[PDB]
Every structure is written in structure tokens, then in C-alpha cells.
Amino acid sequence: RFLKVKNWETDVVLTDTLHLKSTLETGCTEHICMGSIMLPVRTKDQLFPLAKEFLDQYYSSIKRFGSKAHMDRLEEVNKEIESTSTYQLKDTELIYGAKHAWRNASRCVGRIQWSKLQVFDARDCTTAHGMFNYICNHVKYATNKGNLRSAITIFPQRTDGKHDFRVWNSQLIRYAGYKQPDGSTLGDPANVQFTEICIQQGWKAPRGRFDVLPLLLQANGNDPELFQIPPELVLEVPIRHPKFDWFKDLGLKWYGLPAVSNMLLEIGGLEFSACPFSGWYMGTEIGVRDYCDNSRYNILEEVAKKMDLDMRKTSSLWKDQALVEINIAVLYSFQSDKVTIVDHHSATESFIKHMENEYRCRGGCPADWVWIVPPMSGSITPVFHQEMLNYRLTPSFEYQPDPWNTHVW
Amino acid sequence: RFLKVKNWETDVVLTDTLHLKSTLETGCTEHICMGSIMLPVRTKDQLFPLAKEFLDQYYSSIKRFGSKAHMDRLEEVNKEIESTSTYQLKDTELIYGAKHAWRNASRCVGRIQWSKLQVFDARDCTTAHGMFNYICNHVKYATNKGNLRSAITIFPQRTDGKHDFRVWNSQLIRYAGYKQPDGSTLGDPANVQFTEICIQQGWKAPRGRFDVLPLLLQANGNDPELFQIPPELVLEVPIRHPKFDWFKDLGLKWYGLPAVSNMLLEIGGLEFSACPFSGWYMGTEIGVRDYCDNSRYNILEEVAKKMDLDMRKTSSLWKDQALVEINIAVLYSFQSDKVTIVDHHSATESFIKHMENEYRCRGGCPADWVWIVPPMSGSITPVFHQEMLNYRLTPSFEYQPDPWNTHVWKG
Ligand code: HEM
Ligand code: HEM
Ligand SMILES: C[C@H](O)[C@H](O)C1=Nc2c(nc(N)[nH]c2=O)NC1
Ligand SMILES: C[C@H](O)[C@H](O)C1=Nc2c(nc(N)[nH]c2=O)NC1
Numbered sequence: 062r063f064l065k066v067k068n069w070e071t072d073v074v075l076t077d078t079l080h081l082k083s084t085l086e087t088g089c090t091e092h093i094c095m096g097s098i099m100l101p102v103r104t105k106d107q108l109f110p111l112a113k114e115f116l117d118q119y120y121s122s123i124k125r126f127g128s129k130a131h132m133d134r135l136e137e138v139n140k141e142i143e144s145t146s147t148y149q150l151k152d153t154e155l156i157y158g159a160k161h162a163w164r165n166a167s168r169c170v171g172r173i174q175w176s177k178l179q180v181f182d183a184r185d186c187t188t189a190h191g192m193f194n195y196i197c198n199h200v201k202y203a204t205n206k207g208n209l210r211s212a213i214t215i216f217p218q219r220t221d222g223k224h225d226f227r228v229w230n231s232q233l234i235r236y237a238g239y240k241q242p243d244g245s246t247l248g249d250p251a252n253v254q255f256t257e258i259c260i261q262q263g264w265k266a267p268r269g270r271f272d273v274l275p276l277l278l279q280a281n282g283n284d285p286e287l288f289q290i291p292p293e294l295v296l297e298v299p300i301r302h303p304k305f306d307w308f309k310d311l312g313l314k315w316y317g318l319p320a321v322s323n324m325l326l327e328i329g330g331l332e333f334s335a336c337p338f339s340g341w342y343m344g345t346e347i348g349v350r351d352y353c354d355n356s357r358y359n360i361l362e363e364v365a366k367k368m369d370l371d372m373r374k375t376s377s378l379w380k381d382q383a384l385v386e387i388n389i390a391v392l393y394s395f396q397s398d399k400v401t402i403v404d405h406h407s408a409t410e411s412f413i414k415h416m417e418n419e420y421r422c423r424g425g426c427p428a429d430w431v432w433i434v435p436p437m438s439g440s441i442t443p444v445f446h447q448e449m450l451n452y453r454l455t456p457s458f459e460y461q462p463d464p465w466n467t468h469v470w
Numbered sequence: 471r472f473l474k475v476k477n478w479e480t481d482v483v484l485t486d487t488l489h490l491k492s493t494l495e496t497g498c499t500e501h502i503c504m505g506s507i508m509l510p511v512r513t514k515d516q517l518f519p520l521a522k523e524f525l526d527q528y529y530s531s532i533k534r535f536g537s538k539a540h541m542d543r544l545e546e547v548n549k550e551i552e553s554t555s556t557y558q559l560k561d562t563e564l565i566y567g568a569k570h571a572w573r574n575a576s577r578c579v580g581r582i583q584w585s586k587l588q589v590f591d592a593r594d595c596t597t598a599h600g601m602f603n604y605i606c607n608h609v610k611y612a613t614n615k616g617n618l619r620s621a622i623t624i625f626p627q628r629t630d631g632k633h634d635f636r637v638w639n640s641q642l643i644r645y646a647g648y649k650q651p652d653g654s655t656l657g658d659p660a661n662v663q664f665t666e667i668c669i670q671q672g673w674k675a676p677r678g679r680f681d682v683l684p685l686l687l688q689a690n691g692n693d694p695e696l697f698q699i700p701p702e703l704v705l706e707v708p709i710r711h712p713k714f715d716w717f718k719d720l721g722l723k724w725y726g727l728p729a730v731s732n733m734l735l736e737i738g739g740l741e742f743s744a745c746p747f748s749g750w751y752m753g754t755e756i757g758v759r760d761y762c763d764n765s766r767y768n769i770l771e772e773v774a775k776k777m778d779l780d781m782r783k784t785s786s787l788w789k790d791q792a793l794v795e796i797n798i799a800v801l802y803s804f805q806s807d808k809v810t811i812v813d814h815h816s817a818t819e820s821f822i823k824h825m826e827n828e829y830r831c832r833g834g835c836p837a838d839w840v841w842i843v844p845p846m847s848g849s850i851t852p853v854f855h856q857e858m859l860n861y862r863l864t865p866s867f868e869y870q871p872d873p874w875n876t877h878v879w880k881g
């Protein structure tokens with residue numbers, strides 16, 4: 062019932078009671094753990110309970126659990142569901158839900174900032190052009206001249222599933238990926254398929270290495286449209302090294318605003334299929350994953366060469382040595398240009414603090430170790446030695462099929 | 471029920487059917503994953519099934535399933551069980567059992583070597599002095615002057631739980647740890663409690679930074695006894711760096727033979743509480759964990775200073791830079807002294823090949839991602855990008871309580 066988690070470096074032991082309020086499944090079973098697997102419309106009857114569960118936690122959060130207001134609201138929503146087969150959240154409920162979906166995101170190491178989320182209610186939006194406007198405003202607000210501010214923009218909830226709002230991009234801002242005749246890949250291999258669905262749509266791609274993709278926005282279930290994010294709104298950082306002047310020659314740059322846009326936000330049974338959100342980068346995301354993954358910009362060898370390291374045998378740890386230098390470059394570049402960014406040591410330390418805060422004020426904190434531990438220097442960060450319990454709490458952010466595999470033009 | 475795992479770097483997808491043979495539990499439920507939790511006597515009733523299961527797997531592997539030999543053996547065992555409440559494994563079965571416990575060890579990244587395990591049958595052992603001798607032979611055989619060979623020595627199985635054989639040490643070779651009155655620790659902090667027990671039992675502690683601990687051996691449920699491993703049998707490697715001549719001045723060194731000695735080997739329902747086993751090190755075990763964990767030797771700062779790195783702000787990644795150099799030092803020193811060792815890049819690439827092979831020839835490979843991924847440079851090793859399924863098959867190696875917590879002292 063009550064589970065405990067120990068940190069093997071500090072001996073601190075926490076008791077988890079929050080998992081008792083878990084609803085959704087985890088992919089795991091008493092017989093098999095799938096903790097390392099990346100990816101393990103509602104009816105009136107289904108919706109009622111979800112809405113009730115949500116309202117209970119909401120009113121409980123405002124110290125009005127069981128109050129007339131609570132009962133009234135519950136009755137009101139109940140009537141609305143029976144009638145409209147769905148319901149609308151109050152602005153207050155919307156903000157609470159979004160903040161909590163972030164609070165409940167077990168794979169996010171940056172949750173100590175959860176309560177500071179800026180919520181942009183775009184539920185009144187009706188067209189793709191309207192979505193573009195809302196998105197540009199989000200980008201400008203969150204970028205804030207490099208002094209990044211977390212934010213989320215929430216478009217209209219799902220209805221019948223044939224009038225869904227969707228942002229086809231996986232991130233508001235990402236670099237293009239095109240398959241060369243050379244057999245190689247120019248730009249970001251991760252975005253080849255999406256890039257081709259755009260280019261196909263008429264996008265005149267400079268067919269370069271770091272070309273900002275266009276937004277492909279889908280409003281009310283209609284076919285998506287393209288738009289070029291005002292260049293003046295896309296903050297980018299040229300990557301150079303504090304010691305290797307040849308580094309800048311590598312010709313590397315990355316954008317400053319990480320804005321996941323293909324997820325689905327669920328609050329009280331309601332599904333918000335277009336809910337782009339953004340925060341700021343943890344260095345390793347760019348330096349380790351985006352730059353060094355073999356299926357991404359895969360730049361290790363080239364950097365190793367420039368460093369003139371013995372790349373004859375893996376045991377010289379040339380990959381490791383290079384990895385560190387690259388990551389030092391990313392952090393240096395961002396910091397130099399006054400753009401918000403956090404190193405993995407600092408971020409993990411704050412997550413440990415957040416976990417403790419969460420355990421005492423809330424009884425726990427769902428966390429996915431596989432995702433929380435940074436992709437480099439694992440055991441050198443405190444989270445590596447921290448036992449974590451992963452479970453699903455709602456409101457939540459969920460994965461959802463890429464639209465081009467569901468859309469019917 | 472077929473379960474598929476995908477590698478996100480190569481798109482290769484594998485199907486697992488082997489998990490169906492899993493009967494033990496994981497600690498997880500459909501509502502909570504305990505994948506990152508370190509630690510999530512039998513009766514005739516329960517022993518019969520366990521024995522049959524094992525013998526069936528054994529006879530199938532030798533292509534004699536259903537043979538008369540298979541049937542007679544089952545008959546022989548059950549009779550022996552009802553007759554004595556337990557049973558004895560044939561030599562062949564023990565070897566098969568030990569090899570498979572290794573093959574089924576989900577936290578081990580070195581399993582591509584599972585079939586080459588050298589098994590030493592020490593089931594005829596009756597005393598602690600006898601255990602010492604078997605252990606000395608195991609160390610000399612496994613060390614092989616630096617050309618390490620994997621081995622395991624198996625002492626008598628548990629009977630009534632009152633006559634257990636146990637190796638009180640956590641590893642056959644490990645350095646003492648001493649808590650100082652000023653609160654600091656001399657040596658290895660992970661072994662402070664065991665070191666205290668040794669001293670209490672009579673060990674005269676040299677009180678240095680790298681003192682090899684004495685063996686504390688328990689035979690047949692009796693109080694444990696102390697033995698010193700012949701120094702000439704303990705291979706050590708002074709740690710130096712190929713470019714930084716001051717590294718050697720840190721006075722670091724480590725032993726070459728990693729030999730876990732506190733786990734329990736379960737085969738056919740039988741429990742072998744003393745089953746020390748050894749392989750060879752993956753560099754990061756020493757370089758990242760033993761040397762850089764804050765609760766171990768914790769040398770990152772010192773190394774960092776000597777390298778004159780900006781230690782004012784973490785964003786300099788001075789911790790990361792020093793960590794890399796230290797691991798370069800460990801590999802280089804072992805290679806120079808011609809002592810077997812494998813870097814994490816090489817070991818993980820080998821595990822991926824082993825895992826794919828296992829899926830094809832066995833239908834799966836239980837693996838604990840949390841343990842398999844190296845403690846440094848995770849994503850630049852292939853295992854990071856590999857989805858894995860964690861489940862428990864027997865034969866298996868299991869954790870067991872430290873003996874000082876359960877032992878009934880005879881005096
Ligand atoms: C303020 C700075 C923030 C930091 C430093 C941070 C950091 C991280 C990191 C490093 C990851 C893993 C990224 C990856 O490997 O792809 C992550 C994942 C995630 N974060 Fe945060 N985050 C921040 C803000 C946000 C915000 C504002 C939200 C939502 C409102 C959020 C929701 C999530 C979710 C749901 C995931 C998992 C996404 C997936 O499964 O791909 N994060 N975050
Ligand atoms: C041949 C060389 C070997 C290599 C390179 C190898 C490598 C490793 C490594 C890197 C670990 C993680 C250790 C830690 O973090 O403490 C591990 C764990 C493990 N290995 Fe292997 N191993 C080898 C041989 C063996 C042998 C001979 C056996 C058994 C017969 C074995 C049984 C296990 C088990 C059961 C664990 C988990 C131990 C625990 O929970 O503390 N390994 N191995
Ligand atoms: C297979 C495995 O789940 C996958 O390679 C992982 N991806 C990620 C991870 N962690 C983060 N933060 N992001 C990932 O994409 N941990 C492991
Ligand atoms: C809490 C967490 O499970 C613990 O810190 C871990 N220990 C280890 C690990 N992996 C290995 N190989 N060895 C460990 O001791 N992964 C994580």
C-alpha cells in the first residue's frame with residue numbers, strides 16, 4: 062500500500078501515498094516490467110466519472126471540498142454532459158488542469174517550475190490562421206528576448222473526433238530533414254517524413270542544414286495549412302567553444318525554444334488534441350541527443366577528428382571526451398547569448414529538491430527514471446541514485462498518433 | 471502473447487515469447503512501475519514442481535525430453551524428495567544450472583559469455599578452512615595471471631536453514647573501509663560495516679586506503695572464521711593516466727578480479743547460499759562508480775583540481791571532464807598491465823549482439839535497462855536506444871540478507 066523510495070547516496074527515504082490515487086495503467090504487470098518501452102471519443106457514461114474525479118481534486122485544492130459550490134458545479138457539469146454529451150471547463154479549472162498535467166508528467170525533470178506555467182486559452186479559436194496567430198504570440202511571449210518563460214496554448218477540445226484541432230509539427234520549431242541522392246540526410250533525420258509532407262504541400266525549402274520548418278496547422282478537423290513563423294520570432298544560437306576556435310567552424314546552431322506540439326492534454330475526461338507547450342532546454346537535450354545521436358545530427362566523429370583524438374580504439378574514450386566538449390559548447394553558446402538554458406547537474410539537483418517538496422506536500426511524485434536520468438554522466442547526477450516510482454495521474458499529457466496517419470483529406 | 475521491443479536507433483524490432491516462461495514476480499503492477507527500485511525454507515509441496523520444471527528444461531536442452539533417462543531422473547528425484555525433503559543435482563545439471571542463472575541475470579551486460587562459465591563443484595565442502603581452499607583455487611584459476619577467466623564455486627545447498635554455507639564478504643576481494651572519529655572515511659565507505667565485523671572477529675587492520683579484506687567464511691551454519699587471501703594471489707593494478715603524469719600520484723589502484731560472493735543461486739528449487747562468482751571488469755564499474763560515487767572513494771574534486779578546471783560553476787562540466795579522464799586512466803592502466811577489462815562501448819555493443827541472438831535462438835532475453843545502461847555517456851552506447859523487457863526466469867541469482875543480520879551465533 063504505502064511504498065518507500067530510498068536515495069542510495071543520501072540515505073533519505075520517502076514514503077509514497079500519492080500513487081494510491083493512480084488511475085491509468087503503466088504497461089507493466091506483476092510479471093513483466095516495460096519501464097524502458099517508449100510507448101507502452103468518449104461516451105457520456107465514461108465522461109461523468111472523469112469529470113467528477115477532476116472536480117473533486119480541484120475543489121479539494123482550493124479548500125472547498127464538499128462545499129455547496131463544489132456540489133453545484135458538479136451538478137452543473139453533470140447536467141451539461143447529459144445534455145451536450147460533453148462540457149466546458151471554467152477558466153480557473155483550465156489553468157489548474159494544465160498546470161497539473163505538467164505536475165504529473167513523470168518524464169519531465171523540470172517540474173519544480175510547474176506552478177509558474179503561463180496558460181493561453183485559445184478555446185475560442187476557429188481557423189488555421191487563428192491558430193497561427195495564437196502560436197506566434199505564444200512563441201514571442203515564451204521566448205521573451207532569451208529570458209524564456211514556460212507557457213502552453215490550449216486550442217478547442219475534441220468533440221466527435223472529426224473536428225479535432227491538431228498541430229502537425231512535433232515541436233513548434235524544428236529543423237528540416239531531406240533525403241539526399243548521396244543517400245545521406247541533410248538536416249534533421251528525425252523530421253524527414255514531416256518535412257516531405259510539407260515540401261509536398263508547397264513549402265519552398267532552402268534545402269539547407271538548419272532550416273526552420275513551417276507550421277502545418279489543422280483547425281476544426283479541416284485539412285492543415287502552412288505558415289512561416291516570423292523569422293524575427295525564432296531565437297537561434299550559434300554554437301562555439303570557450304577554447305576551440307575551430308568549433309564555430311563546425312557551422313552548428315540550435316533554436317532556444319523547446320516547444321513540444323504533438324501531445325494530447327487530458328483534463329477531467331476532456332481531450333485537448335492541440336496544446337503546444339514550451340519551457341527551456343537542459344543542455345544535454347541538444348549536446349547529447351540532438352547533436353550526437355546516430356540517427357540525429359550524429360556529429361561525434363567529426364568533432365573527435367578536429368580534436369585530434371585517437372579514434373582507433375573505443376577504449377581511448379574519444380567519443381566520451383568529445384561528447385563533454387560539445388556539451389560544454391552548447392552551454393557556453395546559450396549562456397553567452399543570454400538565452401535561458403540549464404545544465405544537467407543543476408536541473409537534476411532541482412528535481413531532487415522538487416521530489417522532496419512533492420513527497421511532503423503531496424505524498425509523492427510520479428517519476429520515470431529511464432527518462433529523468435540525463436543521457437550523459439548518469440551516476441554523477443543525484444537522480445541516478447534516487448529510486449523512483451512511475452505511475453499515471455490525471456490531468457496528464459499523452460502521446461497521440463501522428464495526424465497524417467489518421468487524417469482523411 | 472507476443473511482446474515486441476524496438477531499437478530506436480536502428481528501427482530493428484524483436485518479438486519476445488520467452489517471458490511466458492516467467493513465473494516469478496517483478497514488483498510492478500498494472501498501476502505502478504518499480505523498475506528503478508534496487509531491491510523490489512522450502513517444503514515438499516513447493517519443491518516437487520520446481521524440480522520438474524528445471525529437469526524438463528535440462529532434458530530439453532540436451533535433446534532427451536521424454537526419454538527414459540528423463541523419466542527415470544524425475545522418478546529418482548521425487549522419490550529422493552519425499553524420502554529426504556530435498557534432492558541432489560547431478561554434476562551436469564549443476565553446470566547447466568549455474569550457466570543458466572548467469573544467462574537469466576537481467577542486470578548483467580556481460581552475458582554474451584554465459585556459456586563459457588567454469589563451474590567448480592564444492593558441494594563436498596564441510597568446513598570454513600575447506601571453503602578457504604576452494605576460494606583460493608577459484609581466485610588463482612580465474613585470475614590466470616591477468617588473462618581472466620569467468621568462474622563460480624558452488625558450496626553445499628541449504629537444508630533446514632540452520633546449516634547454511636555463507637561467504638560473509640560481499641566480493642571475494644574488496645578494500646576495507648574505516649569510519650574515522652572526525653566523521654571521514656579511510657578506504658572504501660561501502661565496506662565499513664563489514665570491516666568492523668572483521669576487526670571484531672580478530673582481524674588486525676593495517677588501516678590503509680586500500681587494504682584487501684580477509685575472508686569471513688561460514689560453513690554448515692557455524693560461526694564464521696577469518697582467513698587472509700595469499701597476497702601473491704591478489705592481482706592489483708596501480709592507476710595511471712597516459713597523458714597526465716600526476717595521476718599516478720593520486721595513489722590509486724584497484725584489484726583486477728570482480729567476484730560477487732553474497733548472492734544466492736537457485737536451481738531446481740534448491741538454494742545455494744554460498745556461490746561466489748567472477749568475470750572481469752567493465753571500466754565504468756571502477757572509474758565511474760567505485761571512484762566517483764560520492765559515497766565511495768569520491769575522487770572527482772581532487773582530480774578536477776589537478777586538472778585546474780573551472781569548478782566555480784557546474785555548467786563548466788568540470789565534473790564530466792574529470793570523470794572521462796579517470797575512466798581513461800582505469801582502462802589504460804589495466805590494458806598496460808595486461809589485465810582483462812572491457813570499456814563500456816565495447817561491452818554494450820556486444821550485449822546488443824547477444825540480445826538479438828537470444829531473441830532469435832531463445833525467443834527473448836530478460837534485461838534491466840536501468841542496470842544495463844552504463845553510468846556515464848548513456849546515449850552514446852547502443853543499449854540506451856534499445857527497448858528491453860525485464861522478467862525473472864530460473865535458474866537465477868538472487869539477493870539475500872547480510873548474514874550478520876540473521877545468523878544465530880553459537881559462540
Ligand atoms: C521550464 C523548463 C523545462 C525543463 C528544463 C524541462 C525538461 C525536460 C526534459 C529534459 C525532458 C525530456 C526531453 C526529451 O528527452 O525529449 C522533458 C520531458 C517532458 N516535459 Fe519538461 N521541461 C520544462 C518545461 C516543460 C513544460 C512547460 C511542460 C508542460 C507544460 C513539460 C512537459 C514535459 C513532458 C510531458 C515531457 C515528456 C515528453 C515526451 O514524452 O516526449 N516540460 N522536460
Ligand atoms: C565476463 C565478464 C563479466 C562482465 C564484463 C560483466 C559485467 C557486469 C556489470 C557491468 C554488471 C553491473 C555491476 C554493478 O553495477 O555493480 C554486472 C551485474 C551482474 N552480473 Fe555480470 N559480468 C560478467 C560476469 C558475470 C558472471 C560470471 C556472472 C555469473 C556467473 C555474472 C552475474 C551478474 C549478476 C547476477 C549481476 C547483478 C549483480 C547485482 O545485482 O549486484 N556476471 N555484470
Ligand atoms: C529505449 C529507451 O526507452 C529510449 O532510448 C530512451 N529515450 C529517452 C530517455 N530519456 C529522455 N529524457 N528522452 C528519451 O528520448 N530514456 C531512454
Ligand atoms: C536507484 C537506482 O536503481 C540505483 O541507483 C542504480 N544502481 C545501479 C544501476 N546500474 C548498475 N549497473 N549498477 C547499480 O548499482 N542503475 C541504477
Ligand SMILES: NC(=[NH2+])NCCC[C@H](N)C(=O)O
Nearest residue numbers: 319340341342343346347351
Ligand atoms: N526542455 C524541454 N521542454 N524539452 C522538450 C523536448 C525537446 C527535445 N528533447 C529537443 O531536444 O528538442
Ligand SMILES: NC(=[NH2+])NCCC[C@H](N)C(=O)O
Nearest residue numbers: 728749750751752755756760
Ligand atoms: N563485471 C563484474 N562481474 N562485476 C561484478 C560487480 C563488481 C562491482 N560493480 C565493483 O565495482 O566492484
Ligand SMILES: [Zn+2]
Nearest residue numbers: 089094498503
Ligand atoms: Zn515496471
